[PDB]
Amino acid sequence: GTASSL
Amino acid sequence: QPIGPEDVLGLQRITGDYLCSPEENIYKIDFVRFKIRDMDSGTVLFEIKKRFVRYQFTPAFLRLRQVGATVEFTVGDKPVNNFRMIERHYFRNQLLKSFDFHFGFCIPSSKNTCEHIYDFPPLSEELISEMIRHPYETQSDSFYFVDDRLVMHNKADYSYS
């Protein structure tokens, strides 16, 4: 999910 | 009103909405790198550098055992204590597994790097097959806490077809 934030 | 870790640790399904707004990221946590690699082979599976993501993987992904996630992020003006993520993966709203990663303390205006490890839950040949055959019904919620208070929420879905 952290990939959403880039 | 303030969502804590014990709240999300009981979640029975993927949330129907986001549990916070973008403005609740008062710490200005900003991810600048995200990388996952297979721990068996050492292969990079996905890297992104500098609130919803869709991934498209292959069936072989579902045979991995362990995957390493490296993250780099910056923080703004306030110190950040007990930064933590709880990320919950479901298939058709059945929990596959919940991961709980601690990042620690970050001083203001810092960039920080951590690597954590995902250990796959056990998956049965039936389950895998269903997962391959139903793309994007595998979903995840990523819940980010500073000092036990929810500050970000990211969603994802996955295809293995």
Ligand SMILES: *C(=O)CCCCCCCCCCCCC
């Ligand atoms: C999204 O941005 C985080 C994506 C991380 C994907 C790899 C995590 C390991 C897969 C979870 C195990 C459950 C699926 C079988």
